[PDB]
From TrEMBL, chains A, B, C:
Family as reported in the entry's similarity comment: Belongs to the MIF family.
Identification of the protein by name: LS1-like protein
Source organism (scientific name): Arabidopsis thaliana
Gene: T18N14.40
Domain of life: Eukaryota
GO cellular component labels: cytoplasm; nucleus; peroxisome
Length: 100, 100, 100
């Protein structure tokens, strides 16, 4: 599974490894795959507009080589949204997550 | 709905707010959603090759949380392509738009 | 067809035209379209984590305006993965390729 994240947050001088560690373990647990086979692509400093302003926001897509369930989708959106919120102060209300 | 745009145009020192204002109102009107719930992700300065050259070009994807129609797809491609053309001189012949 | 490539490889001071030339001809031959109608979007210097490390890696998506076959998908993954390997030393084991 590949989690591709695009956000307007600037990661200059930010240690993103605490995030990668938590997200990769969390996604791996949710989808039921080994943590080493979760690819994370994190692209910051991309201009975003949402809600009529440029507050911290993110768009993410996850591509899983296999079907999933409604509950797995709910858990992914909730968990990734929380981890993004906890680490980068992207509020879940400004997080759009396509689950492919 | 999230409109994710990737282009080789350089937005250094460019006021993109006139574009965000027109595109968000236009997309909102076409898909029938409030303008504040249209996310726009605009990533410039990405190398693109098309038609054998590197002239101004763009790839875009729109993710709508609901079905649409053939006419809505036509209107989105025509309208977004025009707004990109008008504001950033990306010619619609060099605009590839995936409507998810 | 549009081939959108995201990688952690840094293309500063790299001539990417040898790559564009080979990939566009190879994709065009595989999918059966003129080489001038293959768009390539190559975005480097994007942080990626896979296999628990940040070695050279890439995520790619190809959007074809028409159906394809299992064999065409196999040929695209094998061929693009090889060209990325040959030119940018991205090993195919660290190449995730979504064929839409």
């Amino acid at each position: 599974p590949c989690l591709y994240i695009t956000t307007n947050v600037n990661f200059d001088g930010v240690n993103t490894d605490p995030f990668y560690s938590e997200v990769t373990k969390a996604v791996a647990s949710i989808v039921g795959r080994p943590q080493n086979l979760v690819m994370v692509v994190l692209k910051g400093s991309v201009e975003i507009v949402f809600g009529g302003n440029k507050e911290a926001a993110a768009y993410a897509e996850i591509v899983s080589m296999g079907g999933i369930t409604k509950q797995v989708k709910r858990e992914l959106i909730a968990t990734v949204g929380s981890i993004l919120h906890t680490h980068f102060s992207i509020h879940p209300t400004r997080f759009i997550f396509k689950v492919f």
